[PDB]
Amino acid sequence: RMAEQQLYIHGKFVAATSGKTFETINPATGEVLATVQAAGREDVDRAVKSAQQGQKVWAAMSAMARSRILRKAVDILRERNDELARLETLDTGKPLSETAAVDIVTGADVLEYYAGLIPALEGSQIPLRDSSFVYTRREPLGVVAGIGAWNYPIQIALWKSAPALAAGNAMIFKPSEVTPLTALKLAEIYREAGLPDGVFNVLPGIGAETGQYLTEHPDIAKISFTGGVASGKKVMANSAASSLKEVTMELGGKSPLIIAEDANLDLAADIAMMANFYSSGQVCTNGTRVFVPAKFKAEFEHKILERVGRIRAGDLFADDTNFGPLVSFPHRQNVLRYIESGKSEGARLLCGGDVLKGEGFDNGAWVAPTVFTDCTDDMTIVREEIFGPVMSILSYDDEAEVIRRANATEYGLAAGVVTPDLNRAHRIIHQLEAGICWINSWGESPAEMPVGGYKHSGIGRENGVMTLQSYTQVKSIQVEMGPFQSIF
Amino acid sequence: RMAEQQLYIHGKFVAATSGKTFETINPATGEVLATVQAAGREDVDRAVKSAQQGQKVWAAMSAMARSRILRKAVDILRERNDELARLETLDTGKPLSETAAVDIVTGADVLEYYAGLIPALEGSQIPLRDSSFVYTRREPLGVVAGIGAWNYPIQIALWKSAPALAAGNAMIFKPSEVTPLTALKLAEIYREAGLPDGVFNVLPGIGAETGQYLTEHPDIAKISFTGGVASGKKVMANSAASSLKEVTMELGGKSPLIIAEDANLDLAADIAMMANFYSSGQVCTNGTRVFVPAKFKAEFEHKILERVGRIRAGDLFADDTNFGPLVSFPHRQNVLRYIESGKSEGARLLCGGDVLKGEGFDNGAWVAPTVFTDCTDDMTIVREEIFGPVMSILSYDDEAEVIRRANATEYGLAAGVVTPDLNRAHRIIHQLEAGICWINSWGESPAEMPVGGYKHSGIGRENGVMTLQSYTQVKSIQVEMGPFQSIF
Amino acid sequence: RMAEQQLYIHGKFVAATSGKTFETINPATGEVLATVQAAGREDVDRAVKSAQQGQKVWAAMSAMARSRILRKAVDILRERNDELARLETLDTGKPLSETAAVDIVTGADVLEYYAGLIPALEGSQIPLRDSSFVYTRREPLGVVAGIGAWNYPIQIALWKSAPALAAGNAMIFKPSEVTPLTALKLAEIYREAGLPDGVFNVLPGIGAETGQYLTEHPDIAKISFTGGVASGKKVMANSAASSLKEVTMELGGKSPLIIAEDANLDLAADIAMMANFYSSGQVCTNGTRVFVPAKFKAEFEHKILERVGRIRAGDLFADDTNFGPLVSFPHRQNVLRYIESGKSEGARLLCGGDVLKGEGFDNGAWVAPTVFTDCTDDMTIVREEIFGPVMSILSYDDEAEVIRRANATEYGLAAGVVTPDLNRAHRIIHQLEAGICWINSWGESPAEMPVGGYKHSGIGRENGVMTLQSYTQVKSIQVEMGPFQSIF
Amino acid sequence: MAEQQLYIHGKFVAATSGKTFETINPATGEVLATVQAAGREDVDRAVKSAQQGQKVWAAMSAMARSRILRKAVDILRERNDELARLETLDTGKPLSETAAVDIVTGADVLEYYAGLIPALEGSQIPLRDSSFVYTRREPLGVVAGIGAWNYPIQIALWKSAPALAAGNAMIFKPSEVTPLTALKLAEIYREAGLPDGVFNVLPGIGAETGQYLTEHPDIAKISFTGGVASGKKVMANSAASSLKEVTMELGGKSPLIIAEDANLDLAADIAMMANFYSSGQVCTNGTRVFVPAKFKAEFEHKILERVGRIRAGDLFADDTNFGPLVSFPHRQNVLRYIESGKSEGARLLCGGDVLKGEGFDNGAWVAPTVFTDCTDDMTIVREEIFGPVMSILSYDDEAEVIRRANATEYGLAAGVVTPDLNRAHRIIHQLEAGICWINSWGESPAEMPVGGYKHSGIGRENGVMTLQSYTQVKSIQVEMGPFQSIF
Ligand SMILES: Cc1cc2nc3c(=O)[nH]c(=O)nc-3n(C[C@H](O)[C@H](O)[C@H](O)COP(=O)(O)OP(=O)(O)OC[C@H]3O[C@@H](n4cnc5c(N)ncnc54)[C@H](O)[C@@H]3O)c2cc1C
């Protein structure tokens, strides 16, 4: 057990005034990791007033002064990488082999990226005529709010807070109630790095209360949300109805992986595995519809079975473990229901499909890596995001067909193609309706690369130079040096 | 009167299948200008399918081919300026002295600007390592919808359709039911210029039906809305609940005009007049809170009274007319309610405050130019947007005070300062919470200059290079040329 | 015969005061096309004072006013395309099948592109602290000079004058003494479109006199030169000694075409043909070193010989003619000297190598399409730019080798690769030391694409957005609103 | 000090020239150090070293390069005082300046560019469904910087920072007057993790070492700071040799325009800072001060009062704010100009002679000097002096002063002092100078591009554009459609 976790407001831990708490569980054992205070409406208002005061100090500093502070936080994150990863593993159930190599490393990469860009944030100047010109300022939005998801807690906290802070804002961050612990550690790290009090406040709580209070508050200028497609629609509605906030949404997907007829099937199988079974399949960008040519389908299935047989579930801190439990028992129940739907709708179960049992598994929400084949576009498992380790294999005959079927979805997050052919790779990718496209790979998300969804998978983008800009608002200023003429 | 006005879908006028119609009234006479068909749910679906087909043809053309077609539309608009202006005056009540000099001229200015920028729309390329790089595409959103307001009907239709079309999209445009006529002429003009069938469709109708059907349609990727704060909040909510659409909102304001202690009061009075009584006060950016130093208030009031006396209401086609009726009789009733509110709360009526009477006015929706003084920050006329010819004059003592009071509003659209002092002009403007700021002038909105609101006055921007980009969506593409490594 | 050609200064033809003239020869017949006046030192001084006056009028116009004038020049160039192409064919010897399809079409494409970009030319704004900010202006250089080459006379005149004019400068253009005629026609076209007098002046003359006088003039702010590597080095030196002018240089190359081991040899042969024998080999970007894998060399040679046999020399105005004489008889003598060196140094002559003979050829400066094989890196024909129809075929064994040999040159203009493999194409191209790189094609130069040389092949770039910016100069302006502190 | 060597490939190495030169302490006349001079063979060795290091450097990730330059920034901040004392010994500038400006703003620029490395991006241009273009911003390769003597280490950092950040190696030739801090910077870069060969330093004289750099066939770009005459030679020899890209930051005769509504205390402070900082050895100095006739007398009085507070003395004393000139030959040239001002009829307001007495007789001191009643034809008004010599000129109306401010072959900087919104922007927009200050002088933020119009320069330094200018664009067309040959 850990000590009781409090709110983080204005550079210090503080008790919530809500009188409410919740528990976060270790998904591998079921033990209570901590009791956590839940922010109420009054706590949210305190956090906003704290953020308004800190934002003014932060914005008044020089650009390089802000850069240096964020870089100090990067340095602390690098030093504490392994410790934070262990905490993330306890809170999420993801293997340490993942968390120590990806979660903090790539979160800190984005913070480090934006820290260096702060001095490059510039407005524009537009000559109109000798006697008048326009210039623009990219001004901070003010106080912004981030709402996190549970699959990559500290990485999401860093990907939202880095551009927000770098753009001169304060952010109030609400982590998922499933995984609140690393966000609180990040808040301390920022303060240690010299971030002014109030610039990064963290309010654990449940979505129906703490999250809603943030989306309704009249002095928060922008909401950035990561989570499911459904929950996203609700947040975006409430943010508009209350105070017309700017919005960013990073939602789920049903992303297609297209294997071309000229692909090497070992490479294609390796990409499909990494696109489906990393983080136990709990990744928004996963390539969960795998399109394979009919002539290669049988051989591809064999190569998938061989690789799935290698997956190593077990002790999450052991080096050779590469597969974990799902984050919770309710989430596994939902994944199990999708698996049962696949069976009842006539998809062929290639492997997996059941809970794991026995010593070391009975206390966690483990599901075996699962692969369905003989899938068709009308099946529930093919149409809906599962957010578990469930691959759907679909046969196709020609390039025009596969593009059509890949695009025939309300989702739009990611896509990829496996082919050695120059023309085929670019030609196919240019026609796919997704924001994140991978050629002969999957999953890499460089700090420089803007990422987000088409269609129901998102609004706006994260990462890249454009996301620094999107956390500012443009003010246009006309200087009229000629004599003003009134017609009255 | 005109013949029953039909919908415009796929390069031709077509009858609505809704069985519903509405009337547009000439606000100068009360007569019916035309009966207009209202697009039904099935009509909207037809328009979307038409737009999808046209967008594909349009996007497949070269960038310069798109530029030439928009440039031909510009040429037709310049040629037909006077004819279109006369129709706009009939539909809106704005004097021909305005519509023939501003509405089409500045609408076409924006179309001409975006036509030339089409070839400069570029993605990026990012080296990761010798064996991998990223490039981005700025892809069309697809089909977008624009929903217009009634104060600048054809100008709004051009400011929305120009960046949308230039970015490679098709737009379905719903004009205000108050002023539907010039949008239909624009649709014909675009087709005459060579715009492919379906790329610009126009669907008259009422907001609760035709507008909502557009905000709900699953195949429309973005909604751009101009109108009131209230209706915007509804539009943004329904667009989210339906299909998670990207959104732009240009709403109203209560913009402050700050007269500095060193301002020339003849200039300040001229700016205040142009910021309040152009288009009979029906301009979202109007500077309807005029802050004047206490020591200058009496002299400024005298200068305003003098200039108000020069306003020339009359025949909207007469050369010397520079003031018109309001857009509709229901709108006049709301403006009269605000005026009575000002009287009942004790604001001092300096001039106006009643309808115009006599030959040539009894049949039009005329409100006299009205000025209230001795106003305070809590009065209803000071807090709420009136959208009529009602100036509120507020006394103030010092610079810090006036900046706070200017900013103490949920609105955020525009602001201005009158001062000959270098430091004062930039110092004050940099502290105002508004997207559109004028120094020693008011109202000019160059095609190059991004415009839109802070806080409740808007989401996103129009005009400028940034708005061409905001009608595209970013696709990031990673080319991995090294061997892909799976951990399984 | 044509009338004596005069200088074009300040919107009209005017007599030179040098007392000197020169003749331009029709390379198909040896006849004198025209006597042309040569601008002397005083004529250059007159042209600069004219340009100084016109530049002020031009820069004082609005951006869109300049845009519209250049667009009118585009419209005239489209209408007169065939007439201008016929004159270019008479002056250069290039077939009408080329000049009517490329020279004016792509020249006007660049003018049309930059006309549309004028309003997007913007400076920057940089906040330093609450009390100080910087903004930048992109100001015209003033009077700039362009010095053209003889292979693409009017295209070069357009590619230099379009960005210079669009950026607000006046340009004095000196066409090659070999090909002066179409530049004078362009000057008339600009005046007809509304270009202010003095903004585009044309001074025919010889390089040692008129060209040098321009490079030395103290009131010319920039020189843009297209021509041979040697003459460029001299122009750049003389510009520095005089008044430290900005410089752009587009010089020749010895560009490599790399045929990969997996290439289709018909495609490779087609690309090699277009890279060597268009415009009778007089293209700076030609792929005159063709690297072929040893295993495919014999077959590649056979495919080249088959296509060379199809080349159709003849009447330059006939539709089926696709090969012309060289631009002048002295240039033919130099090409023949290079061919003789190839023979004497042991390269194997596969075809051509002599003048064309018989009726319709004896009086023109014809050289047969020539192909050498078994070439080695030390041969004169492999190391030096020939600027005639002479392909050198070189065998190679592995990818590392061909990259090294492709790069082992002082030239750096263009390069290309023929391969269907995704990784091979990007991997190889990323390692080549050239500014213009083509994958599975050759020769296309879109207006959007910056083009220029590495190493000895050039300084700066033409086309693209960057070249518009390179015809402005940055002024940085700091506004200090805080109290200035002196240490004295 | 010990005899100073070349720095090639991460180590000090003896020169192969057999030649050396001396750097003099301008405060005492003593020899500070004997310095080895790089010969033509040393330059070729430096280039081959740089070619090797650049490939290692460019192959690293962008953030790996960023981190290494940031470590160099951290070392520079820690050793600010040590480097500043060395700079003061070599240049004669007061420690009060070198410890506050030279390294601080040098490191500021390095720190700025370190953060921008990951933002360096090419473009992508769709042509049609079957073809697109993308561009790469590739390193130039090996570039050379040739420095001036007034801000030795700052110039070394302002040239090397964008060059290194863009993925190039730089060979740096410091001025022979002031070679010492550049060698220190080379050690700091290596300590920070910079690959061997990426920053090589070759001391030597301009006529030999500098010329050998401009002539070398494998150097892709030259960045030069110095005088117009040497610049014309550099740019010519760079073209004649191998057609190198060239950037030049030359001198100026920058005008300071005092408006009719200016506060004269503010104007006098700006004129003082624009003329007597670094003993007047600043390229951007506002050495033509235009004052309205109606205020001329009062302005002169305010200038004289501020000149009287100038504190020449021990360059390591806290209150010292004025030093000797960088060298004794430079002083004779400055005295030549001062005597020209006297003989052409300018009125001497103060100064005009060397400083004398204990502690000054052995240093290259020139007193702060002010001329008034100046006219546009005078030599001191037309030519850059690069010493502490202010020229005051009267004017009557705004159009006149703008014409006269612009009537020069120089174009580096300019400024206006006025509280009026319209006057400040209106006048500045009409001045033909690259660096313009309103109600201030001298501040040169890392973000702000700076360089000259007309004879004052080619290209710019600082800002995002200068990072880009140390790359070359490669355009790449991908044709996915079938290629059509007409043959
Ligand atoms: C049954 C019915 C009949 C009506 N008949 C008429 C009539 O005959 N004449 C008339 O002038 N008005 C009519 N209205 C509309 C009414 O006057 C509203 O006040 C309407 O909002 C006025 O639109 P506006 O453009 O003035 O203002 P705003 O409400 O600001 O409208 C701005 C724009 O948004 C659109 N809009 C408004 N609400 C929505 C929404 N919920 N979803 C999408 N788009 C929306 C408007 O149509 C317009 O294009 C009718 C409404 C209903 C429900």
Contact residues, C window 58-77, toward A, CB-based 8 Å cutoff: 60, 62-63
Strand stretches in D157-220, DSSP E: 169-173, 199-201
d(CA D141, CA D197): 12
Q: Which of B177, B284, B301, B375 is catalytic?
A: B284
Answer yes or no: do C126 and A122 touch at CB < 8 A: yes
- Rounding to the nearest 10 degrees, give the CA dihedral for residues C403, C408, C413, C419: -20
Residues in Cβ contact with C344 at an 8 Å cutoff, skipping those fewer than 6 apart? none
Q: Are D275 and D259 part of one and the same domain? A: yes
Closest partner residue to C130 among A60, A130, A425, by Cβ?
A60
| Nearest residue of B to residue D120, measured between CA atoms | B126
Q: Are C12 and C97 part of one and the same domain? A: yes
**Adjacent-strand bridge partners of B226:** B250
Q: Which of A98, A177, A284, A301 is catalytic?
A: A284
Length of chain A: 488
Element (H, E) at B146: strand B143-147
Q: Angle CA(C459)–CA(C461)–CA(C466) in degrees, nearest 5? A: 130
How were these coordinates obtained? Answer: X-ray
The answer to whether residue A147 is domain-embedded is yes
Secondary structure (3-state) at C265: helix
Å from D117 to nearest chain A CA? 8
Question: Six-digit token pair at B300?
Answer: 């400024």
Å from C234 to nearest chain D CA? 7
Residue type at A155 in one-letter notation? Q
d(CA A98, CA A78): 15
Element (H, E) at B256: strand B256-259
Strand stretches in C331-386, DSSP E: 348-351, 370-373
Q: Are B342 and B384 part of one and the same domain? A: yes
Q: Does residue C434 sit at the D interface (CB-CB below 8 Å)?
A: yes
Strand ordering across the sheet containing D457-458: D12-13, D6-7, D199-201, D169-173, D142-146, D221-225, D245-249, D457-458
- The CATH number for C236's domain is 3.40.605.10
| Nearest residue of D to residue C249, measured between CA atoms | D243
Q: Does residue A133 sit at the D interface (CB-CB below 8 Å)?
A: yes
SS3 content of chain B, % helix, strand, coil (to 5): 40, 20, 35
DSSP D350-369: E--SB--STTTTTS--B--E
Å resolution of this model?
Answer: 1.9
The answer to whether residue A484 is domain-embedded is no
Whose CA is closest to B170, among B55, B7, B45?
B55
The answer to whether residue B49 is domain-embedded is yes
| Nearest residue of A to residue D445, measured between CA atoms | A119
In the block, which residue shows the tokens 């004393």?
D317
D398 among known catalytic residues: no
Q: Angle CA(B419)–CA(B421)–CA(B425) in degrees, nearest 5? A: 65
Contact C258/C364 with Cβ under 8 angstroms?
Answer: no
Whose CA is closest to B111, among B58, B151, B153, B164?
B164
Residues in Cβ contact with A186 at an 8 Å cutoff, skipping those fewer than 6 apart? A154, A157, A158, A161, A200, A202
Q: Are B106 and B178 part of one and the same domain? A: yes
Contact C5/C181 with Cβ under 8 angstroms?
Answer: yes
d(CA C485, CA D266): 9
Contact C24/C181 with Cβ under 8 angstroms?
Answer: yes
Q: Are A456 and A357 part of one and the same domain? A: no
How many separate domains does chain C show?
A: 2
- Report chain C's terminal Cα–Cα distance, integer Å: 76
Answer yes or no: do B465 and C122 touch at CB < 8 A: yes
What is the DSSP-derived secondary structure letter of residue B260? Answer: P
d(CA B248, CA C203): 53
Q: Are A191 and A299 part of one and the same domain? A: no
Which domain does A39 fall in, by range? 7-252+449-474
A284 among known catalytic residues: yes
CA distances, B98 to each of A340, B103, B106, B365 (Å): 68, 7, 11, 18
The answer to whether residue A391 is domain-embedded is yes
- Report chain B's terminal Cα–Cα distance, integer Å: 75
Contact B327/B92 with Cβ under 8 angstroms?
Answer: yes
D249 among known catalytic residues: yes
Q: Are D57 and D79 part of one and the same domain? A: yes
d(CA C170, CA A463): 43
Which contacts (CB < 8 Å, 24+ apart) does range D30-33 have?
D32/D1, D32/D89, D32/D90, D32/D180, D33/D1, D33/D2, D33/D3, D33/D4, D33/D180
d(CA D16, CA D46): 12
Q: Does B236 contact ligand 1 (Cβ within 6 A)?
A: no
Answer yes or no: do B117 and C115 touch at CB < 8 A: no
Cα B406 → chain centroid: 22
Provide, as residue numbers in chain A, all residues whose Cβ is less than 8 Å from the Cβ of D447: 63, 119-120, 122
The answer to whether residue A485 is domain-embedded is no
Q: Does B224 contact ligand 1 (Cβ within 6 A)?
A: no
Question: Six-digit token pair at A169?
Answer: 């804002």
Contact A158/A263 with Cβ under 8 angstroms?
Answer: no
Element (H, E) at B390: strand B390-396
DSSP B6-57: PEEETTEEE--SS--EEEEE-TTT--EEEEEE---HHHHHHHHHHHHHHHHH
Whose CA is closest to B33, among B79, B75, B1, B58?
B1
Q: What's the sign of the alpha-carbon dihedral B330, B332, B336, B341?
A: positive
Q: Are B293 and B196 part of one and the same domain? A: no
The answer to whether residue D170 is domain-embedded is yes
**Adjacent-strand bridge partners of C266:** none
In the block, which residue shows the tokens 């008259």?
B204
Q: Does B211 contact ligand 1 (Cβ within 6 A)?
A: yes
In the block, which residue shows the tokens 């100078």?
D433
What is the DSSP-derived secondary structure letter of residue C148? Answer: -
**Counting atoms of ligand 1 from 1, which one is nearest the CA of B214?**
43
Helix (H) and strand (E) counts in chain B: 16, 20
Contact A322/A97 with Cβ under 8 angstroms?
Answer: yes
Contact C336/C349 with Cβ under 8 angstroms?
Answer: no
Contact B417/B260 with Cβ under 8 angstroms?
Answer: yes
Question: Six-digit token pair at A184?
Answer: 């609180």
Q: Which of A88, A98, A385, A462 is catalytic?
A: A462
Provide, as residue numbers in chain B, all residues whose Cβ is less than 8 Å from the Cβ of D121: 124-126
Size of interface A-B (CB pairs under 8 A): 208
Whose CA is closest to C134, among B153, D463, B119, B486?
D463
d(CA A376, CA C165): 60
DSSP B283-350: -TT---EEEEEGGGHHHHHHHHHHHHTT--BS-TTSTT--B---S-HHHHHHHHHHHHHHHHTT-EEE
Q: Angle CA(D247)–CA(D251)–CA(D255) in degrees, nearest 5? A: 125
Q: Are A295 and A158 part of one and the same domain? A: no
Q: What is the 3-state secondary structure (H, E, C) of D65-76?
A: HHHHHHHHHHHH
DSSP C44-98: HHHHHHHHHHHHHHHHHS-HHHHHHHHHHHHHHHHHTHHHHHHHHHHHH---HHH
- Report chain A's terminal Cα–Cα distance, integer Å: 76
The answer to whether residue C484 is domain-embedded is no
Q: Does B38 contact ligand 1 (Cβ within 6 A)?
A: no
Q: Are B244 and B259 part of one and the same domain? A: no
Q: What is the 3-state secondary structure (H, E, C) of chain A?
A: CCCCECEECCCCEECCCCCCEEEEECCCCCCEEEEEECCCHHHHHHHHHHHHHHHHHHHHCCHHHHHHHHHHHHHHHHHCHHHHHHHHHHHHCCCHHHHHHHHHHHHHHHHHHHHHHHHHCCEEEEEEECCEEEEEEEEECCEEEEECCCCCHHHHHHHHHHHHHHCCCEEEEECCCCCCHHHHHHHHHHHHHCCCCCCEEECCCCHHHHHHHHHHCCCCCEEEEECCHHHHHHHHHHHHHHHCCEEEEECCCCCEEEECCCCCHHHHHHHHHHCCCHHHHCCCCCCCEEEEEHHHHHHHHHHHHHHHCCCCECCCCCCCCCECCCCCHHHHHHHHHHHHHHHHCCCEEEECCCECCCCCCCCCCCECCEEEECCCCCCHHHHCCCCCCEEEEEEECCHHHHHHHHHCCCCCCEEEEECCEHHHHHHHHHHCCCCEEEECCCCCCCCCCCECCCHHHEECCECHHHHHHHCEEEEEEEEECCCCCCCC
Strand stretches in D20-121, DSSP E: 20-24, 31-36
Nearest CA to ligand 1 atom 25: B176
Question: Six-digit token pair at C64?
Answer: 């869109």
Pairing type for strands A123-129 and A132-140 reads antiparallel
Secondary structure (3-state) at C405: helix
Contact C119/C63 with Cβ under 8 angstroms?
Answer: yes
Whose CA is closest to A325, among A359, A363, A360, A367?
A367
- The CATH number for C335's domain is 3.40.309.10
The answer to whether residue C486 is domain-embedded is no
Provide, as residue numbers in chain C, all residues whose Cβ is less than 8 Å from the Cβ of A136: 125
Q: Are A54 and A198 part of one and the same domain? A: yes
Cα D348 → chain centroid: 30
- Rounded (10°) angle between helices D398-406 and D421-430: 30
What is the DSSP-derived secondary structure letter of residue C484? Answer: P
Answer yes or no: do D117 and A116 touch at CB < 8 A: yes
Chosen from C56, C137, C422, C473 to mutate, greatest number of chain A CBs within 10 A: C422
Rg of chain B taking only CA atoms, in angstroms? 24
Nearest CA to ligand 1 atom 14: B206
Q: Are B295 and B418 part of one and the same domain? A: yes
Alpha helices in B225-264 (DSSP H): 229-243
Å from C207 to nearest chain B CA? 36
Å from C344 to nearest chain A CA? 42
d(CA D23, CA D152): 13
Contact C455/C410 with Cβ under 8 angstroms?
Answer: yes
| Nearest residue of C to residue D477, measured between CA atoms | C438
